[PDB]
Design an enzyme around this catalytic site. Structure first.
Site, PDB file in Angstrom:
ATOM      1  N   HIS G 200     119.012 -17.957  21.517  1.00 12.96           N
ATOM      2  CA  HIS G 200     119.969 -17.332  22.270  1.00 12.96           C
ATOM      3  C   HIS G 200     121.414 -18.302  22.580  1.00 12.96           C
ATOM      4  O   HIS G 200     122.249 -17.871  22.938  1.00 12.96           O
ATOM      5  CB  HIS G 200     119.727 -16.435  23.595  1.00 12.96           C
ATOM      6  N   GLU G 270      91.703 -16.321   2.727  1.00 10.26           N
ATOM      7  CA  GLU G 270      92.271 -14.806   2.571  1.00 10.26           C
ATOM      8  C   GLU G 270      93.451 -14.748   1.990  1.00 10.26           C
ATOM      9  O   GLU G 270      94.301 -15.980   2.056  1.00 10.26           O
ATOM     10  CB  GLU G 270      92.201 -14.408   4.162  1.00 10.26           C
TER      11      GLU G 270
HETATM   12  C1  LIG Z   1     114.780 -10.857  21.466  1.00  5.45           C
HETATM   13  C2  LIG Z   1     115.457 -10.453  20.177  1.00  5.45           C
HETATM   14  N1  LIG Z   1     116.489 -11.030  19.809  1.00  5.45           N
HETATM   15  C3  LIG Z   1     117.217 -10.502  18.657  1.00  5.45           C
HETATM   16  C4  LIG Z   1     118.653 -11.374  18.286  1.00  5.45           C
HETATM   17  C5  LIG Z   1     118.908 -10.858  17.022  1.00  5.45           C
HETATM   18  C6  LIG Z   1     118.458  -9.799  16.359  1.00  5.45           C
HETATM   19  C7  LIG Z   1     117.350  -8.922  16.854  1.00  5.45           C
HETATM   20  C8  LIG Z   1     116.571  -9.367  17.898  1.00  5.45           C
HETATM   21  C9  LIG Z   1     115.655  -8.774  18.424  1.00  5.45           C
HETATM   22  O1  LIG Z   1     115.049  -7.748  17.692  1.00  5.45           O
HETATM   23  C10 LIG Z   1     114.954  -9.202  19.508  1.00  5.45           C
HETATM   24  C11 LIG Z   1     113.701  -8.521  20.166  1.00  5.45           C
HETATM   25  C12 LIG Z   1     112.337  -9.019  19.720  1.00  5.45           C
HETATM   26  C13 LIG Z   1     111.249  -8.295  20.286  1.00  5.45           C
HETATM   27  C14 LIG Z   1     111.321  -7.261  21.035  1.00  5.45           C
HETATM   28  C15 LIG Z   1     110.043  -6.286  21.702  1.00  5.45           C
HETATM   29  C16 LIG Z   1     109.148  -7.784  21.702  1.00  5.45           C
HETATM   30  C17 LIG Z   1     107.947  -7.907  21.480  1.00  5.45           C
HETATM   31  C18 LIG Z   1     107.226  -9.005  21.729  1.00  5.45           C
HETATM   32  C19 LIG Z   1     107.501  -9.891  22.635  1.00  5.45           C
HETATM   33  O2  LIG Z   1     106.611 -10.957  22.961  1.00  5.45           O
HETATM   34  C20 LIG Z   1     107.076 -12.421  22.803  1.00  5.45           C
HETATM   35  F1  LIG Z   1     106.184 -13.021  22.446  1.00  5.45           F
HETATM   36  F2  LIG Z   1     107.831 -12.791  23.721  1.00  5.45           F
HETATM   37  F3  LIG Z   1     107.880 -12.319  21.488  1.00  5.45           F
HETATM   38  C21 LIG Z   1     108.801  -9.902  23.029  1.00  5.45           C
HETATM   39  C22 LIG Z   1     109.648  -8.528  22.861  1.00  5.45           C
HETATM   40  C23 LIG Z   1     112.802  -7.006  21.390  1.00  5.45           C
HETATM   41  C24 LIG Z   1     113.669  -7.466  20.927  1.00  5.45           C
END
Ligand SMILES: CC1=Nc2ccccc2C(=O)C1c1ccc(Cc2ccc(OC(F)(F)F)cc2)cc1
Ligand code: FES
Lengths: 46, 441, 75, 59, 99, 239, 378, 64, 195, 415
Positions: G200, G270
């Site tokens: 970010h 695997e």
């Molecule tokens: C943060 C993001 N940034 C982006 C930047 C540019 C383009 C696409 C994206 C995303 O798609 C994106 C995102 C990723 C995941 C999620 C749901 C989610 C699932 C698991 C999580 O657990 C962790 F371990 F922290 F990862 C957290 C969140 C929603 C949104």
């Protein structure tokens, strides 16, 4: 209660004049008056 | 002697129609001065795409001479009797009016008639007034307020005559021949489409007879112009121009249009939210939550709510001018206000809104000119002057429940039209704006 | 990172758009969709496909080569 | 009379409170319907093969 | 000279022209390019801004421009060269002075 | 060391949504009971597992009661033998692998609980193995006790052909041909290795339907929101 | 002003999941980040539920896993979700990396390197996971792979016995493999947050490889709704495997208990390790083969240095496009060859594929970048 | 009485089977004739069974 | 001028209901919202159906497995225990005492003093059939009481010094609660299932 | 009950004037001799802060209550400053005049001017000034006065930059306590009875009491590079209340005092035509006429192109010279009178402007002069008086102010 003739901002780019028809009315003919209020935008008169 | 009483003894408006169909209307009181004029159901809505801006072009030529008084003869005569001559054109209403001494009312009515009917429209004078409009068009580009509102209409009523600007495209201004103008005039300037209004020291009887003398020649007789409805569209127009130092945003939902009783309750709601700018005395302690929040947090430099009315439609919303980092927060609090009024408006705040509106329209009608205008235009919009006593009846009827139900009709879960101009990077995405038109509770 | 309103400088670009309630979710979905897909597929095909043709060949060659090697030779 | 989608909007979807109650009620009616309906599809696809079909032979 | 045939082929194969981009729009923004962009006059910068905006919007729709509107090979002005050349030339001088 | 892989027999449970023929399982169990339970263990299947699958509660109780099993200790501190119950697993032939090897000349008979899952080809493989026993080809002989089976890796296996015509009379009186015996036992060994089979496939249908419903709906919601951007027109308007 | 930007917890969520400026034009290859997260959470849940029933004791381990599938309520669907979930994880990983390679996202150095770490951590987790059932391929896979470290001179032989906590893969090894296998996903989750933290800082790359600041859209609703659709497609893929072919991506030999005597015919890891397993077997020398297997993954850290093209993405780059797809097809070949017995022609194919893998990354794709530049007068 | 041995016969009289059965019988009376060579005939049998049992599979299960 | 800008034609993308530029969109506003929100509402119902099932399964996981339910109950044959004699059983890894009681033991435990007991329970509410008393084997510090012994002629414990009567109630000793009455039902008049 | 104005001057000096007209709305104005002129060089810009400072806490009402209470009843509270007067004005529906009156009295008779509130208000001086100075007329007219005077009327209405952030609570108290006094106050009203106003003024407005404007003649030049040059040239005219002042007013309208027709070419305006004869590029010219208790300024204001400023000012000045020389016919003076006569009646047409004139008169003069007497006084101006006014201007000591790119704008001594 009623909003004024002109809504006032600071830092807002000036409104232009290009012809005789828009420029007349502007030349000051009487001394300044200033009003401030609670409801109405602040105005300065000739 | 109370307020309720005071309304009962406000001078009535007199109402009469001529043989051709021209109405004569007049409010009377011993006053040394007066205002009289002609209001016409004509403007940009009645213009097609190729003759757009004609009504505006006419307005320029109106006071530039007549057949009876060529060139500056009309001009000279108005000045030398200490009369003030003025005009305006909206999307639906063109209007010419004169402020004069009460004793000069005969000549005043005569001159108005001469302007309307026997307008010179000289070859040289047209080509002169052509460049004038083009320069006003350039001036208008530097008024961000004007530009954003023109944009709001253009997107709100897209692909209709209401999308069209009053001034017309520079294309039309550069091309419009004298043939176009005279054809426009004879089609739209007709006796039943017009109203002769006057206020001040005037015996109604005398005005009506002066109307006979000079306005008898007016035509009142295929394909009679009747404005079609205009389709509102939930849309966005975004003129991104980071070179300008402040952002102008204008947002509105579809309003009901002139006729509708709901307009009264909408005015009450709009008064609650109200208006603000940076020169206001109120600041933090202001009654309007949008205003006090906007003042304390320096969100905007200025904002106003507006309920623009047209025939069978309109624009109900707000305009604001703010810092390039404040657009999102402005939108948030404003839409927050619409939602709060829809869902949960209180009795006491509606009473405040009522009291604002009562005060608003009683004090606006002060002096011959605004009263003359209210007469002229009310006849065009409503088909009568609505007495102050009746406005008061409609206002007293509005309670908290009404404001909720009325606001919920127009604002709640409805697609707005958004116009933005300037450094508008932050200005919320349409979906986020559209989602801000409802609450999840 | 950077918040909306501090991203970059943009001048003299108008953006017109519609509300999702004013429009269709799938305008000309097959009508314009099908040709655009064929165009997209043709555009990348002989960049994407040749290596996988080569895999198919090296696979089917190598597999039945392993079978033939395990057969007895007539001598 | 307004269109069917419009009747659905004014009666069920407008207030977010009614919209949510609708989802909860609809989920119940859907659940029993879907389950019973899909099970029927499965048991017809496997006619006479399941214990449910051959149960009667040993009771 | 003789490889001008291949250059013309490669140009169309690469296909940024189909989004109405010039070569210099596609350059990966390092610190030199950033400075070079920053040094562009109002006209050249806003053109760049639009061209990219347009290209990204096209990429978002998975579409290209009409063939009429494609950037012709010969019409591809090298707009960033003089600024970028000098930004690089400047840094190389500072790097030299630092030895 | 050539290899002959089994062909794909069209089983009653071969398809996507196709359940096991439970009657088949009921016969197949008896093929384990009468024939392979004196050599192969099946440790992970208990008498209770049969209930609601191939036998009733009462039938499975009778099947359980039929067998010996050790239990203890009692208060004296001794290990006794008792009649089986539903909670008991299928009893191992030998006490350990070392005992098993001795009874089958070195070779250990594998546990059958997972045999379908533990061999490439599964029930197709086992069926081919059971029915595929034949006389050796020219130029071939193995150690005395290793039989010829073509489907077995290395062409030679240490199991005596276990199924033949009328090796067992079925409870429901299905004509017990070598083929029919093999078909039934495989169907049982399929269930042994994968009890979930039917439930799994019931869920598969319900998943496919819900996905059939949800995917286009979610996709429509996606297009709805994105429609603002998909429509949009850009204009470049310098002074 | 709202309580999304104000509240210290909501502030983080508002900036990284709602108001995040995302490029307008990012394709389906940007969905894999979200899906990797889903995979990770999915593994943790299904894993934790399996851990409620499993035992790390060598005698009871295989039994407990089967007891899950037979007696534990819906234990089977949990078990096979977790096993196919591991496959879905690696599919998602390789797609996510491929995106990075093709679109040049690796220029985001910190994000990229943390990525390499994440990959390596997920690999370590999944290697030790496969051991837990204590079947044949579990035990013999673990034995051969671990024992590769003995090829290190001086210390290697000690190291191997130290990991094991004994003289073969036995009691002490399985118990510690369970403990490490439990803890690592949580470490992954932390490193994954550091991964986003860095992402970010710049915001996201896009398919063009050209800066998208001129056309950023808010993450919500645009990409929240896409991610939901993507998640739904991931659930379909997973559940298609779990409910219709749960053993398709596994091996049968892992259904017979681990036997320290009886060796399986063709012992292999695997599927998602097969490419690197093939690289190992290309080199005849054992220490060489280990260093090659090591370098087949670690080379990812080299990629950002190996960039030659003046353009960022491969979108406008024909030669690179083809060499990229060659590299993909080559990896598919290494996965195939990895699955095969060590014989003709699979040895020579394998050698040739392994030479081609490193040749593509270290020589051909760099040169192709420079050729492309010189074709554009750059 | 077994449907299997019926179908095994039925399938045995197909072009691919009978051609492979002849290949089997060629090496039958090639090895069993010649002396002192360690080559056998497993391969030829498996060729035959592959073709046979593919056909057997296609329609054996109908009679069961 | 900015008056030269006119909004592009969106007819290609518009819904049918909003195509007519001379008609009001407000007719169709009720409807167009309805359609789109139905899709959303349907989706939510479907996801609810899913999440219900997924969560429900995971919750199920933690509940007693098939093999623990298998040891939940124990069948006991009533004709296999003679009148007067106790018979011990293994139930949930504990002893379980079933006792055939004589007409003497029934009447002798019927008119016992209600108040004098440390744990006041009458006999009519400790059992479901008069001639059968089912109890789980010591409440103080956990031993196995020996049958047909003690002062009160029922169960006695050689650990600390507890005396239970024929109804299983503590009479004289350190135990705080009487031997526990489990959950059971007679099925066929010949059989009993405990559990 | 047809109604005309009532008038009272209390023994303590205070004026009450009120027309009960039975309208629904009621305007009440407290006019005070407390304009910018009564600042000295130590407290410059105090009256500007004071103008912004109503709705700060008072003794009887909080800062919050002034805003909320007035807004509750849909009312308005306004403060208006000239160089000579300050005017505190309230509007509302007639039922709520009691409430608004209480607020008005609190704001004027007992403001607290709390240190934290006064300090917090300081940035508002900058905002209010900044906004106002976007009108280039504000630049020139404030400069013009500063050029024209030595002391009182020289004062600007807006606080000097150096004083922003520095106007003290003491100064605000001092200014009110010294200037808001019975002998300096006029309480005017519409739609309220005169007896109840009198009683309010006796009981709540009995407050005890607390240098002449020297004309200088100078020039001030704001060099700023606009393509347009605003410029004003004046000489000392007569004081308001004197008969000669009426002559200047007529001369103003002979020369041309703003437009009558929209987009009009001003065929009767002596100045506009005089300038338009020579130079046809965009421009505006009007006669300028201020009149005060001590003094007055008369001249003209030009708006011209930067290069044309020399030509425009000179042409305009020449037009006054010919009027001074004697070139003036009756039809011109008759037209000018008709303008001024109409202008005056039109300015008092609204109940807003009427209130301004009643209060305005009440301070600078003894009592109310009806419209009929005023028009008779305009007629009383002979053509001779107009030529004398013009003569006075031409030979009188000059004051000038300009803003723009002044490269072709002359100095006073360049005319
Ligand atoms: C943060 C993001 N940034 C982006 C930047 C540019 C383009 C696409 C994206 C995303 O798609 C994106 C995102 C990723 C995941 C999620 C749901 C989610 C699932 C698991 C999580 O657990 C962790 F371990 F922290 F990862 C957290 C969140 C929603 C949104
Ligand atoms: S332990 Fe048996 S009673 Fe105390």
């Amino acid at each position: 209660a009623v909003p004024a003739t002109s809504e006032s901002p600071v830092l807002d780019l000036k409104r232009s004049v290009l012809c005789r028809e828009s420029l007349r009315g502007q030349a000051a003919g009487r001394p300044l008056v200033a009003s401030v209020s609670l409801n109405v935008p602040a105005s300065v008169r000739y | 002697a109370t307020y309720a009483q005071a309304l009962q003894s406000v001078p009535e408006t007199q109402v009469s129609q001529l043989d051709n169909g021209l109405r004569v209307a007049s409010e009377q009181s011993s006053q040394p001065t007066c205002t009289v004029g002609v209001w016409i159901d004509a403007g940009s809505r009645y213009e097609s795409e190729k003759n757009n801006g004609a009504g505006y072009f006419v307005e320029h030529l109106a006071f530039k001479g007549t057949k009876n008084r060529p060139g500056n003869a009309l001009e000279k005569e108005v000045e030398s009797m200490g009369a003030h001559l003025n005009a305006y054109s909206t999307r639906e209403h063109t209007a010419y009016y004169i402020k004069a001494l009460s004793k000069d009312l005969p000549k005043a009515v005569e001159l108005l008639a001469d302007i309307v009917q026997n307008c010179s429209l000289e070859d040289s004078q047209i080509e002169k007034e052509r460049d004038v409009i083009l320069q006003e068009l350039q001036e208008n580009d530097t008024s961000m307020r004007d530009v954003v509102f023109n944009y709001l209409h253009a997107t709100a009523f897209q692909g209709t005559p209401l999308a069209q600007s009053v001034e017309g495209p520079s294309e039309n201004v550069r091309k419009l021949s004298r043939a176009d103008l005279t054809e426009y005039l004879s089609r739209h300037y007709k006796a039943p489409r017009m109203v002769l209004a006057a206020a001040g020291g005037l015996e109604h009887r005398q005005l009506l007879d002066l109307a006979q003398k000079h306005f008898s020649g007016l035509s009142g007789t295929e394909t009679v112009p009747t404005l079609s409805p205009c389709r509102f569209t939930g849309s966005q127009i975004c003129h991104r121009e980071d070179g300008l130092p402040l952002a102008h945003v204008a947002i509105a939902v579809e309003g009901p249009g002139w006729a509708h009783p709901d307009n009264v309750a909408l005015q009450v709601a709009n008064a609650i939210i109200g208006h603000y700018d940076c020169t206001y005395g109120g600041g933090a302690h202001l009654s309007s939550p949008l205003a006090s929040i906007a003042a304390t947090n320096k969100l905007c430099q200025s904002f106003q709510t507006f309920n623009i009315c047209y025939a069978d439609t309109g624009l109900l919303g707000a305009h604001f001018v703010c810092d390039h980092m404040s657009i999102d927060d402005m939108m948030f609090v404003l839409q927050g206000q619409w939602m709060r009024l829809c869902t949960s408006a209180t009795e006491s705040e509606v009473l405040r809104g009522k009291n604002l509106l009562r005060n608003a329209l009683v004090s606006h009608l002060d002096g011959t000119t605004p009263v003359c205008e209210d007469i002229g235009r009310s006849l065009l919009t409503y088909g009568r002057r609505i007495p102050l006593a009746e406005w008061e009846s409609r206002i007293a009827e509005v309670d908290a429940r009404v404001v909720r139900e009325v606001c919920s009709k127009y604002f709640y879960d409805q697609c707005p039209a958004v116009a933005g101009f300037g450094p508008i990077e932050q200005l919320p995405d349409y979906n986020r704006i559209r989602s801000g038109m409802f609450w999840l509770r | 990172g950077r918040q909306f309103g501090h991203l970059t400088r943009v001048r003299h670009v108008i953006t017109y758009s519609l509300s999702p309630f004013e429009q269709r979710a799938f305008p000309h979905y097959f009508s314009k969709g099908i040709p655009n897909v064929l165009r997209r597929t043709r555009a990348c095909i002989l960049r994407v496909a040749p290596p996988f043709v080569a895999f198919y060949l090296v696979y089917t060659w190598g597999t039945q080569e392993f079978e033939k090697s395990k057969r007895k030779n007539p001598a | 009379a307004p269109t069917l989608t419009a009747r659905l909007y004014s009666l069920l979807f407008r207030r977010t409170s009614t919209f949510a109650l609708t989802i909860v009620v609809g989920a119940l009616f859907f659940e029993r319907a879907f389950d019973q309906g899909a099970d029927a599809i499965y048991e017809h696809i496997n006619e006479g093969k399941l214990w449910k079909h051959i149960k009667h032979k040993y009771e | 000279r003789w490889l001008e045939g291949i250059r013309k082929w490669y140009y169309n194969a690469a296909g940024f022209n189909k989004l109405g981009l010039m070569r210099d729009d596609t350059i990966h923004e390092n610190d030199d390019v950033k400075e070079a962009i920053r040094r562009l006059p109002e006209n050249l910068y806003n053109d760049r801004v639009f061209r990219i905006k347009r290209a990204l919007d096209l990429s978002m729709r998975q579409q290209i421009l009409p063939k009429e509107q494609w950037t012709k090979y010969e019409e591809d002005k090298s707009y960033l060269e003089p600024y970028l050349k000098e930004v690089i030339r400047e840094r190389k001088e500072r790097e030299e002075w630092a030895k | 060391d050539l290899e002959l892989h089994p062909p794909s027999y069209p089983w009653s449970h071969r398809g996507l949504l196709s359940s096991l023929d439970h009657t088949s399982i009921r016969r197949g169990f008896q093929v384990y009971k009468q024939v392979c339970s004196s050599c192969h263990s099946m440790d992970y299947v208990a008498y209770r597992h049969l209930v609601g699958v191939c036998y009733t509660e009462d039938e499975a109780k009778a099947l359980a009661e039929e067998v010996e099993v050790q239990d203890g200790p009692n208060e004296d501190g001794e290990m006794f033998m008792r009649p089986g119950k539903l909670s008991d697993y299928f009893p191992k032939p030998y006490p350990n692998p070392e005992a098993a090897r001795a009874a089958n000349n070195g070779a250990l008979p594998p546990d059958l609980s997972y045999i379908v899952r533990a061999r490439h080809g599964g029930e197709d493989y086992v069926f081919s193995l059971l029915t595929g026993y034949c006389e050796p080809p020219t130029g071939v002989s193995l150690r005395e006790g290793l039989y010829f089976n073509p489907y077995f890796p290395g062409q030679a296996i240490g199991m005596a052909p276990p199924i033949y015509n009328e090796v067992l009379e079925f409870d429901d009186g299905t004509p017990a041909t070598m083929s029919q015996v093999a078909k039934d036992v495989c169907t049982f060994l399929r269930w042994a290795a994968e009890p979930e089979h039917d439930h799994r496939k019931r869920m598969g249908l319900k998943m496919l339907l819900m996905m059939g419903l949800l995917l286009p709906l979610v996709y429509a919601m996606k297009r709805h929101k994105w429609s603002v951007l998909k429509s949009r027109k850009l204009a470049y308007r310098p002074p | 002003t709202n309580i999304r930007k104000s509240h210290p917890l909501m502030k983080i969520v508002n900036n990284a999941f709602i108001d995040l400026p995302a490029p307008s034009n990012i394709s389906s290859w940007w969905n894999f980040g979200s899906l990797l997260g889903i995979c990770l959470i999915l593994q943790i849940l299904t894993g934790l539920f399996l851990a409620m029933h499993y035992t790390s004791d060598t005698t009871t381990a295989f039994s407990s896993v089967t007891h899950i599938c037979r007696d534990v309520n819906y234990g089977w669907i949990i078990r096979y979700m977790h096993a196919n979930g591991a496959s879905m994880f690696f599919i998602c990983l390789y797609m996510h990396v491929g995106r990075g390679l093709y679109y040049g996202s690796y220029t985001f150095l910190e994000t990229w390197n943390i990525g390499v770490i994440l990959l390596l951590t997920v690999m370590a987790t999944a290697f030790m996971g496969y051991v837990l059932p204590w079947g044949q391929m579990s035990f013999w896979g673990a034995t051969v792979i671990t024992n590769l470290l003995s090829a290190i001179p001086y210390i290697g032989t000690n190291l191997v016995e130290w990991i094991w906590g004994g003289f073969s893969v036995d009691k002490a090894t399985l118990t510690r493999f369970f403990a490490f296998h439990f803890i690592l996903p949580f470490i992954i989750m932390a490193i994954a947050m550091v991964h986003l933290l860095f992402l970010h800082e710049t915001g996201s790359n896009n398919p063009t490889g050209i800066s998208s600041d001129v056309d950023k859209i808010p993450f919500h609703p645009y990409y929240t709704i896409k991610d939901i659709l993507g998640a739904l497609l991931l659930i379909l893929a997973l559940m298609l495997l779990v409910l219709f072919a749960p053993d398709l991506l596994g091996d049968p030999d892992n259904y017979t208990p681990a036997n320290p005597l009886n060796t399986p015919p063709h012992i292999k890891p695997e599927w998602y390790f097969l490419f690197a397993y093939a690289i190992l077997r290309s080199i005849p020398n054992k220490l060489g083969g280990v260093l090659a297997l090591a370098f087949s993954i670690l080379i990812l850290a080299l990629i950002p240095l190996l960039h030659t093209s003046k353009q960022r993405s491969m979108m406008f780059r024909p030669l690179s496009q083809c060499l990229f797809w060659a590299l993909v097809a080559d990896l598919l070949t290494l996965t195939w060859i990895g699955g095969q017995p060590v014989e003709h022609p699979y040895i020579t194919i394998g050698q040739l594929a392994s030479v081609l893998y490193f040749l593509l990354i270290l020589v051909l794709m760099p040169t192709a970048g420079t050729i492309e530049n010189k074709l554009l007068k750059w | 009485v077994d449907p299997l041995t019926t179908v095994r016969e039925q399938c045995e009289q197909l072009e691919k089977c009978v051609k492979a059965r002849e290949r089997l019988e060629l090496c039958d009376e090639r090895v069993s004739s010649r002396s002192q060579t360690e080559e056998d005939c497993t391969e030829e049998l498996l060729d035959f069974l592959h073709a046979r049992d593919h056909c057997v599979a296609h329609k054996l299960f109908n009679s069961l | 001028s900015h008056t030269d800008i006119k909004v592009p034609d969106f007819s290609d993308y518009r819904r049918p209901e909003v195509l007519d530029s001379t008609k009001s969109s407000k007719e169709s506003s009720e409807a167009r919202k309805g359609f789109s929100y139905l899709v959303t509402a349907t989706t939510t119902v479907g996801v609810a159906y899913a999440a219900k099932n997924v969560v429900s399964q995971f919750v199920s996981s933690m509940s007693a497995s098939a093999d623990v339910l298998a040891m939940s109950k124990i069948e006991i044959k009533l004709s296999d225990i003679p009148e007067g004699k106790n018979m011990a059983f293994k139930w949930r890894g504990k002893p379980l005492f079933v006792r055939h009681r004589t007409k003497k033991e029934i009447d002798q435990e019927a008119a016992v003093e209600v108040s004098q007991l440390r744990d006041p329970q009458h006999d009519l509410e400790r059992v479901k059939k008069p001639e059968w008393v089912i109890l789980i084997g010591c409440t103080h510090l956990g031993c196995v009481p020996i049958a047909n012994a003690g002062d009160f002629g029922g169960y006695y414990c050689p650990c600390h010094g507890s005396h239970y009567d024929a109804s299983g109630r503590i009479r004289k000793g350190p135990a705080p609660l009487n031997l526990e009455v489990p959950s059971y039902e007679f099925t066929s008049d010949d059989m009993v299932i405990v559990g | 009950h047809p109604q005309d104005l009532e008038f009272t001057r209390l023994p303590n000096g205070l004026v009450i004037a009120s027309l009960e007209n039975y309208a629904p709305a009621s305007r009440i104005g407290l006019f005070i001799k407390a304009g910018s002129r009564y600042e000295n060089s130590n407290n410059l810009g105090t009256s500007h802060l004071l103008r912004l400072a109503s709705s700060l806490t008072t003794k009887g009402a909080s800062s919050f209550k002034i805003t909320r209470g007035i807004e509750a009843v849909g009312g308005k509270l306004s403060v208006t400053s000239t160089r000579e007067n300050m005017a505190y004005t309230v509007e509302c529906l007639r039922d709520d005049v009691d409430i608004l009156m209480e607020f008005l009295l609190n704001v004027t008779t007992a403001p607290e001017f709390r240190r934290w509130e006064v300090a917090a208000l300081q940035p508002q001086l900058r905002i209010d000034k900044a906004v106002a100075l976007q009108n280039p007329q504000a630049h020139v007219i404030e400069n013009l006065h500063a050029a024209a005077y030595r002391n009182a009327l020289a004062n600007s209405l807006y606080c000097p930059d150096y004083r922003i952030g520095k106007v003290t609570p003491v100064e605000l108290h001092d200014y009110v306590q010294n200037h808001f006094t019975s002998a300096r106050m006029a309480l005017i009203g519409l739609g309220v009875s005169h007896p109840v106003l009198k009683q309010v003024a006796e009981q709540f407005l009995n407050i005890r009491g607390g240098a002449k404007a020297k004309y200088h003649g100078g020039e001030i030049r704001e060099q700023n590079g606009d393509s347009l040059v605003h410029a004003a040239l004046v000489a000392e005219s007569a004081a308001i209340g004197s008969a000669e002042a009426n002559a200047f007013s007529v001369l103003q309208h002979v020369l041309g005092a703003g437009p009558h027709v929209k987009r009009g070419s001003n065929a009767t305006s002596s100045l506009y035509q005089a300038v338009a004869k020579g130079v046809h590029q965009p421009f505006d010219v009007s006669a300028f006429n201020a009149s005060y208790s001590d003094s007055g300024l008369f001249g003209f204001y030009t708006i011209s192109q930067a290069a044309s400023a020399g030509d425009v000012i000179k042409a305009a000045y020449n037009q006054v010279k010919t009027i001074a020389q004697g070139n003036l016919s009756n039809p011109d003076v008759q037209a000018a009178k008709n303008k001024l006569k109409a202008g005056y009646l039109m300015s008092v047409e609204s109940s807003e402007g009427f209130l301004d004139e009643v209060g305005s008169q009440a301070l600078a003069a003894g009592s109310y002069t009806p419209p009929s007497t005023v028009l008779q006084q305009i007629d009383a101006v002979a053509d001779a008086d107009v030529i004398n006014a013009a003569k006075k201007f031409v030979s009188g000591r000059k004051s000038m102010a300009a803003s723009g790119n002044l490269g072709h704008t002359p100095f006073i001594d360049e005319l």
